[PDB]
Structure formats: structure tokens, C-alpha cells
Design a protein around this ligand. Sequence first.
Ligand code: HEC
Ligand code: HEM
Ligand code: HEM
Ligand SMILES: CCCCCC[C@H]1C(=O)O[C@H](C)[C@H](NC(=O)c2cccc(NC=O)c2O)C(=O)O[C@@H](C)[C@@H]1OC(=O)CC(C)C
Ligand SMILES: CCCCCCCCCCCCO[C@@H]1O[C@H](CO)[C@@H](O[C@H]2O[C@H](CO)[C@@H](O)[C@H](O)[C@H]2O)[C@H](O)[C@H]1O
Lengths: 55, 244, 124, 85, 383, 71, 54, 56
Amino acid sequence: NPRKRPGKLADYIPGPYPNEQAARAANQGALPPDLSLIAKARHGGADYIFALLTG
Amino acid sequence: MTAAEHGLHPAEYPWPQNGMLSTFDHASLRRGYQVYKEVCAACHSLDRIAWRNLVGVTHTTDEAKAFAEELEYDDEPDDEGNPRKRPGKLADYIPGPYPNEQAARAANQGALPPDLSLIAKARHGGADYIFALLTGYPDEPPAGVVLAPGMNYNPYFPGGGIGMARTLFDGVVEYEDGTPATTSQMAKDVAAFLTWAAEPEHDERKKLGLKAIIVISAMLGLSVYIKKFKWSPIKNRKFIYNPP
Amino acid sequence: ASITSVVKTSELILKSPLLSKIVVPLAKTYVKFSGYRQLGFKMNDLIIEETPNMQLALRRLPPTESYDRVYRLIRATQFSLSHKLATGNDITKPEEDDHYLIPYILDVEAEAFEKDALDNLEVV
Amino acid sequence: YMGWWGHMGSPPQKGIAGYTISPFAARPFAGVVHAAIFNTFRRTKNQALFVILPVSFFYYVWTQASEKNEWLYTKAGRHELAKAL
Amino acid sequence: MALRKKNSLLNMANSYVLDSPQPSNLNYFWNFGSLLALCLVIQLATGITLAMHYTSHASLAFDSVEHIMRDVNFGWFIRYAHANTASFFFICIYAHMGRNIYYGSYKTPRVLPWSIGVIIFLLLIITAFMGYVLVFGQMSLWGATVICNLVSAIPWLGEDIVHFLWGGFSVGNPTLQRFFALHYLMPFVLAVFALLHLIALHTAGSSNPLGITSNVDKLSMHPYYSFKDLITVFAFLLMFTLFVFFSPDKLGHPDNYIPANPMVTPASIVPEWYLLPFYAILRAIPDKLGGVIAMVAAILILLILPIVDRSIIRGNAFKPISKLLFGFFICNFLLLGVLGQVHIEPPFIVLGQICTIFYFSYFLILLPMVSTIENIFFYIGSL
Amino acid sequence: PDPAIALHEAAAEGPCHDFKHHFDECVERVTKAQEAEDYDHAEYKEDCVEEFFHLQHCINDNTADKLFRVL
Amino acid sequence: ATTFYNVFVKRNSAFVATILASAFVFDMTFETAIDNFWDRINAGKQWKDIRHKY
Amino acid sequence: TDANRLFSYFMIGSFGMLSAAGAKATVQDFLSNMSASADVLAMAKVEVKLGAIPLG
Ligand code: HEC
Ligand code: HEM
Ligand code: HEM
Ligand SMILES: CCCCCC[C@H]1C(=O)O[C@H](C)[C@H](NC(=O)c2cccc(NC=O)c2O)C(=O)O[C@@H](C)[C@@H]1OC(=O)CC(C)C
Ligand SMILES: CCCCCCCCCCCCO[C@@H]1O[C@H](CO)[C@@H](O[C@H]2O[C@H](CO)[C@@H](O)[C@H](O)[C@H]2O)[C@H](O)[C@H]1O
């Protein structure tokens, strides 16, 4: 039978949604990207994230 | 080691597919699939075979799609991201009886029934081993053998005690082609079927090998003529020596 | 090995009456079984020549002996590749199996080994 | 130690005449039947001992060893096995 | 001047495959060189093809090999060709080394091609061993476990080295990925050394079965050896065809069609047939470190043949005692092979020790004695 | 009715009669030995596996071809 | 016979063209011949032989 | 005679013919591994509903 355990240090930080479809359904169709690489995945890096959140 | 520890080595049976020019008997393969489906599939998976693999071997496309469409498989999530099931398609793999190893062992007094997709290649003996094993449960274990609990005596299995009980009895299957379903008949059919599962290229491979044998033999014969032809000046060389 | 070694050891054997009585018949049989004579070789034709010493000894052969050696090697190579043996006059008879090269290689080596010794001399 | 065509490093050759015929003028398989039978028999007879002696010896060794091993792991061989360990 | 001689690039091909001067009397045992070249080409072609379908992740490796067998067009052929040609590579390599020992190809002036050859032989062993692991079946895993735990016998640092090679504390995904990368690479290194041993040989040229100079009587490599090489290519492909198409699993071990399971240990961890003699040598020594040294020494001891052969004559064609000794040596090497696959039980334990002593004593005692005595017999016997 | 049942019986009574007798004798001995008390506290407990294998191996050699001929 | 030589063999361009055209014909006919032979020696065994039941 | 030369070239040409036929077979079979495999070819043929889809 399946089981759950408490998390350990080797575990990855878990996401808010089980899949893309759940993610989009909760965000009026838009898919919030994973943020692990977003600072390398946009021209601008930290500056882009800072500008976007404050802009 | 003792012969017990090795297991009795299986007889060499004359399988239809033994023989450089022989294919499988496809009628046997079809019967063997029916034995797998009605007997083995209760405990054993066949995870590497897709429904499409049966098509044009044992079943027509329609029969195989019918088999796939009777089952439910995991679909991609719906639009609210909830999980969904779909009917099976030909590209789906034949599903196993247990969700994981632990479920499998729990149902089989600890023993884990292996996947049968490769079992004919994964045991010394091949079809002969499968045939010998399924037909080789004696009515009574040899006097003095102590079987561990939940083990059955079978001399072909190394160590003698196998977690799988005898399963083939006369008329456990009703073949659709009117063949009498005797223990030996069903074992022969299922062993043929599993051999096909392990090596599905077998028929094509041996036909291409026949072509290869013929061409390569001819080229070997001709290469020897050509070598002897080109070398004949060197072999036929003669000398006359006059000391200076 | 050096030909000098072979020659010296052989002379020790031929001196000892006991040793020669048991070894010389063996060596004659060995050479019969060896079968180099069946390809028309003399024993000395088989000695490894890709050595500076042996190259020098071969250059010192009298022209006649050298030309004959070249013919025996070419003849044997042809029998080898044909998988035939020598017949008749091509077979080396025991009396024809002369050590034509041993004198030359012993002189070349004598000098080379003297040179090594003298390179290690210590004035007293 | 080996040169190239023209200066291969042969001692000077003189007095050898070599003759051969064209591959198109020869029967490539002349006397092949005689050779396949009589020549192969000659060459094999001459080399037979050098194969037979080592093969027969090592096969006998293996046969003795495999038969002993088989016998030690029988009921009859229980005691001899106990000593051997 | 002809283009093939004028142009620098063409001239290099010309010097190796066309105008190369060869002895006129090379027999069929000189053809294993080109068969090993053919094996190496088949392994590169099939190997690179399998690499296009194989996934090096341990969660997927075994499945990717099943995908090759079942889904890829002709995948069965490419897989079985690659697996069987590895066996044929070792048949040809043992034959080629056997030829070289029997005909004294290791003597001056060919010590360098021989010594590079011994390294090619080590790289082939490593290459084939790593390839075996990539399937990630039971024999793959249990092979990597036991063989990499031999390194644990290296004193002081042994354990550390093992963990470093595995990339972890056991054979697992890191090991599999790194063996994939290395198994891909090693055949290219092996090809380069194969080419170096030929360049080294070019200075002396091929030896020949009589062991005399061939400078007196040369034949161009083409067409004579070209057409002779085709005979053995077709003979090889006939044998290849019988295995690959008709009995593809005859040379292998069924245990590798069970997916790797670190818990369950298989009945019997025996290596692939061609490693078996070295495995027997290792079992013969009771000490773990001793065993490993002996096993490596069994290969490296070939490097001393140039010293321990004291004959004034190259090769065994004319040396009846050396031929007998060589026969015993070769048969003992096969008996070692057989003892590598029996169980560690009486009476094979003692027998394996005797065969191991015989193997080493050939190089260390018998060959030096026998070659010295034959020198004396040739000289006295021809007086 | 399973063809193998009859073929195995025929091969036991016929070409493998000597092996059948061995196995039989063995079982008699072992059963009798188990019947005797302080059998559980014995060092060596005899089986009949060896004899069984000899019999089965023989039966299979005399039956294999015949059995596949009737399927 | 000289004619045959002159046409198909004398020029290498012609000889290689003849070899490749022969290879094409051999390839096609050999395929067909093996197919038929394989079907006769494996009669009633293959899927094509039992397919009619379905 | 031309007959004589022609015979030996028939042997050489037969050998070239089988080598050409064999090379074509080898190449064609071997490179077909690179064509879509059976699992890929099965993931064609996607079936889709239309009941879900609104106008516009
Ligand atoms: C209800 C259970 C059950 C049924 C029915 C069953 N098996 Fe098994 N089988 C097992 C178990 C459990 C094992 C593992 C036994 C062990 O490892 O001790 C097993 C093992 C095997 C093995 C491999 C033995 C080995 O060497 O590891 C083969 C082959 C096999 N089964 C084939 C079949 C075939 C063919 C059928 C029916 C036609 C079949 N089984 C029916 C439970 C079953
Ligand atoms: C990939 C592996 C190898 C390839 C492709 C290869 C190829 C060849 C070729 C083509 C030749 C010349 C032709 C011949 O004599 O057969 C040759 C000669 C030779 N090889 Fe190898 N070889 C390989 C491995 C080895 C090994 C492992 C050794 C030694 C342990 C070795 C030692 C030699 C020697 C000494 C010669 C010279 C022999 C002579 O002509 O007398 N080679 N090799
Ligand atoms: C000397 C050359 C080579 C040898 C001796 C060799 C040997 C092997 C062996 C023995 C295996 C195990 C085979 C099995 O049982 O399935 C194997 C697997 C493999 N080899 Fe090689 N190999 C060689 C070259 C290559 C090369 C150049 C590649 C290029 C990538 C390669 C890729 C693979 C792959 C992907 C596998 C795993 C798939 C499989 O097992 O079939 N090999 N190799
Ligand atoms: C194309 C030019 C590049 C030079 C290297 C290519 C290859 C090359 O030289 O081919 C030759 C045909 C060679 N054979 C011989 O020496 C040979 C010599 C004497 C007698 C016989 N046989 C008797 O009857 C021979 O078989 C051979 O097979 O050796 C390969 C290994 C070489 O490959 C490489 O090293 C590169 C890499 C692929 C390993
Ligand atoms: C240096 C290379 C030059 C470029 C040449 C490009 C070649 C690439 C061609 C791949 C062609 C494959 O095309 C396909 O071949 C396979 C065999 O492989 C044939 O398949 C046929 O024979 C095979 C066995 O040979 C059977 O498995 C199959 O049932 C049958 O249909 C197909 O009828 C053909 O559709």
C-alpha cells in the first residue's frame, strides 16, 4: 500500500501544484514557471526579476 | 555443488522453432497467449510486450484492439488537473497484476513472481526450462526433502523449493481451437509463447540468416577462387640458380 | 642469446666424454625432427639476423657464400608459401650442413664483447 | 632493418633467375585434388603429435577432475568431501 | 612519379595498404590482424549505433536495451552483432597473440610492436568489461561489484579509490553513466594504439613463418594480401552469421537478462568466457592482494618474453621441443579458462593452483631452459 | 487425459526399471529411518533426491521426443 | 564470346555498371525466391497461414 | 582466347555482384535502425474528442 513519510534534507522543495494543468486552472490559464532557473532564463537576471515585481 | 542445488537440467525437447530454418508455430503462440492470459497473468507480468506486438503474430489488429480497449490506463490530467483513466490503445503495454514488488510479494507468501517478458532468455535452458518446470511438479516430494513453508517441490528449480505451486491441470483452459488442453499441451503452448515474447525477432532473424548464409557462402567460395587466381604467379614461381 | 654463448657451452659438452655420449645422439635426432633440412636450409640460415652484430657478420661473408645464402632463403620461402618440401638435391644432406657463418659472427661478437670489457677497465 | 622497393636491404642477389606465368595462363586449381588429399595428409601427419599430446593430456586431467568433483557431491562421496574440506 | 607516392597523404595509405612490402610466405595465421581490424570496425559501427538508442541512466538502461531488441528496426541484429563480435574479437586476439608467440614475433627487432600490443590487450579487456556493465542486468551489476572491489585490496587507499570510481558507495547510476562515457571512449584509444603498433612494426616489417629475413623476397601487400584477407573475412562472417542469426545467446549468460537487483545475488558470478583464464589465476592465490597482482602479472608477464626467450632462432617452426612446450602452454591456458567457470570446490582448487604455477613457469623457467638447450642442440646437431 | 502420465509410467516400467528400483529402495529406507525415534536428533538425514534425479533424467531421455510427437 | 567480353567487361565503366545492374536483379529475385522457400518449409506455421481463421 | 579471360572476370564480377548486393542489404538493414522505431510509430494516430470544444 502507498505511504507518506516526513521530509528529509535530501528531499526537493515541493511545488504547489501536482501538474501543469492544475497550475493553469488556478491561474486563469497562465502557467507560473518554476523559479529555480528563472534568473538565468531571462535576459536581465536579478534586474529583470526586481524590475518586474516592482514595475 | 549437489545436483539438487543446481536443479535438474531440462530435457531437450524438439520445439517447432528448433532448426535453422524453422519459425514458431503461430497457432501454438496464439494458444500460449491464451494460457498466459488465463493462468499466468494472475501473478506474472509481461511488461515489455505491447498490444501492438501481438498483431500479425497471434491476433489480428481488431482482436488486439479489443483486448486493449477492455482495460483502463492512466491518461493525461483533465483541465482542472485531476487524474483520469482512458481505454487502452495498441501502443499500451500489457498491464501487470500488481502495482509494485511489495504487493506482489505480499500476495505470494514473500516470493516475487518475475516478469516473463525475458524469462526464456534469462534462464539456462530457455523454452525447455519453462516446459520442464511447469510439468515437473511430482505428486509427492522425494522422501527426505524438507520444504520451507510456502514452498513446493520442483526438481528443475535450483534448490528444489519453488514459491510457485503447480498451476496447470487438465482443462484449466478451454482452447478456442478445440485442441485438448492437457497439462503438457498447455505447458508446450505457453513455453512457446514466452519464447516468442523474449525473442520476437526470431522468425525474421532466422530468415535473414538464411539469406546471409547463402550469400556469404557464395562470396567465400568466390573469394577463394579469386585469391588462388591472383596468387598463382607466386605459387607457380620457379628458380634456376647459377652460383656466380 | 649470443652465438658465443652457444658455441662455448657446446664445446664444454663435447669435451666431457659422458656428456657427449648422451647429448650428441640427442642433438642429431633433434635436428632430424627439426626438419629445416627439408626446406633446403643450412642450420646457420636460421640464425636471427636483425641485430647490428649479425648484420655486420653477414656483410663479411665471402660473395659466393652470400649469394648462395640468398638463394637458399628465397628457395625456402617459396617452399614455405607453396606448402611443399624440398626434394632430391634441394634437401640439405648432413655433410652439406656446414657452419659457414659461425666463424664470422664469432669474430664480430669477440670484438664487441672485448669492447664492452675494455670499456670497464680499471688501471691498478 | 627493412628498406623499401629498390633498397630493401637484401644482401646483393646475383645468379638467381625467377620464372613465373600469368594468372590467366595458369590453371589456379591445378592438382588441387592431389594437394587437398595427399599434401594435407602429409602436413597433418607431421604436426599431429604436437596437437594430440597436449590435448589428450589436458583432456584426461579435466575428465579426472570433473569426475571426482561429481562423485564428491554425491551421497557416496559425503565422507571424502568432508575430509577434502 | 605516381600520385600514390608523390602526395603525402596518399603516400601514407600507400605505405601501409598497397605498396607495403610483405614476406611472400605469410600463412593464414597472419590474417588475424585484419580480422581484428574488422572486429574493431564492426564494434565501432554497431557500438555507435547502440549509443544512439541507449540511455545511460540506471533507471532506464536495461529498458533501453530492451527497446533496442524490440522496437528499433534491426535493433536485435545490432545488439547481437555487438555482443557476439566482442567474443570474436577475443578469439581473434588470442589467435593473433598465439601466432606472435609461436612465431617469435616478440623478438628483436619487433619488441616495440609487441609491447604496445600488450597494452592493446589490456585496453580491450577494460573496454569489454565496461561494456558488459552497461546493460545493467544482474551480471552487469554483480560483475562491477566484484571486480571493482578487487581494487579495495590496494593497501591504504584501495577503498577510497573504489568509491571514487563508482561515484558513490555502491554500483549504481553514477557508475553506469561513467562507464558509458568510458566505454564509448576506450575503443578510440584502442584504435590509436592499434595504429601505433603497426607504425612501430613498419620499421622491421612482418615476421614470417620461417623466422628468416624476408628482405630477399617481398610481395606488395596489395593485391596478394588483400585477396588473402578476403578469404578469412568471409570465413569470419560465416561464423559471425551462425552466432548472430542462429544462436545469438550461445556465447552469453542468461543472468544478464534479469534486471540488476542489488539485493538478490545471482547463483554464479562468472565473467564472460574470454576473461575466464585470468579469473582462474586470481582464484588460485588465496590472498586478495596476491590474487590481484597475479592476475595483472599474468598479462604483464608477456612483456618479458623478449628477455626470457634465449633462442638464436626466431619462432618455433624448427624447434620440436619448443613446439611441444607451446602446445602444453596453450592447452593449460584453456584449462585455466575452464577452471574459471567451475565452482570453488575440490578437486578444482588444487588443480587451478597447479595450472597457475604452470602458466607462470612457462615464462620464468621452461622457456628460458628450453630455448637455451635448443640452441645447443642446433649447434651440436649440425656439426 | 495427459499424454505424459502414460509415457512416464511406461518408461519407468521399461527402460528405466533399474532407476525405478533404486528410488523405491531409497524411499523404503528413508521412511523406515523417519519411523524410528530420535531421528530428529540425528546428524545426517538421508534424502532420495539423487535417486529421484537419476530416475527423472532417465525418464526424460526416453520420453521427450515421444511426448512432443503427440502435441 | 569475344562480343560478350567487349561489351560488358572490357571497359571498367561497363563492367561496374553490369555488376551493379546484376546486383539489383539478384537482390530482387533472391528476396522473392527466399520468401517463397521460407513459406514452403514453414507451411501452416506462420501468421499468414492461420490469419484466415480471423 | 577471349573465352579464357572472360571466365575469370565472370568469377571476379560475380564476387563484385554479391559484394554489391550484400553491401546494399547490409547498409539498408543497418541504417534502418535510424528510422522511427515501433514505439514511436505507435504514437502516431492520436484520437481527440470534440464535445469539449466550444464555438469560437
Ligand atoms: C498464483 C501464482 C502463480 C501462478 C498462477 C503462476 N506463477 Fe510462475 N511464479 C510464481 C512465483 C511466486 C514465482 C517465483 C517463485 C520463486 O522464486 O520461488 C514464480 C516463478 C516462475 C518462473 C521462473 C522460475 C525461476 O527460475 O525463477 C517462471 C518461468 C514462471 N513462474 C512461469 C509461469 C507460467 C508459465 C505460469 C502459468 C502458465 C505461471 N508461472 C503461473 C507465481 C505464479
Ligand atoms: C585491435 C587489436 C589489434 C589489431 C587490430 C592488430 C592488428 C595487427 C595487424 C594488422 C598486424 C599486421 C598483420 C598481421 O601480422 O596480422 C599486426 C601485427 C602484429 N600485432 Fe597486432 N593487432 C592487434 C592487437 C595486438 C596484440 C594484442 C598484440 C600483442 C599482444 C599484437 C602484436 C602484434 C605483433 C607483435 C605484430 C607483428 C607480428 C608479425 O608480423 O610478425 N597486436 N597486428
Ligand atoms: C572494442 C570495441 C568494443 C567492444 C569490445 C565492446 C564490447 C561491448 C560489450 C561486451 C558489451 C556488452 C554486450 C551485451 O551483452 O549486450 C557492449 C555494450 C555496449 N557497447 Fe560496446 N564494445 C565496443 C565498442 C563500443 C563502442 C565504440 C561503442 C560506442 C558507443 C559501444 C557502445 C556500447 C553500448 C551502447 C553498449 C550497451 C548496449 C548493449 O549492451 O548492447 N561499444 N560493448
Ligand atoms: C587506409 C590507410 C590507413 C592505415 C591504417 C588502416 C589499417 C591498415 O593498415 O590496413 C591494412 C590492410 C592492415 N593489414 C596489415 O597490416 C596486414 C599486413 C600483412 C599481412 C596481412 N594479412 C595477411 O594476409 C595484413 O592484414 C590492417 O588491417 O590494419 C588495420 C588495423 C589498419 O587500421 C589501423 O591501424 C587504424 C584503426 C582502424 C585500427
Ligand atoms: C552510405 C549510405 C548511403 C545512403 C543510403 C540510405 C539507406 C537508408 C535506407 C533505409 C531503408 C529501409 O527501408 C525498409 O528496409 C527494410 C529492411 O531494412 C525493408 O523491410 C523488409 O525486409 C525486412 C528485413 O530486411 C523485414 O523486417 C520487413 O518485414 C520487410 O518489409 C522495407 O521493405 C523497407 O521499407
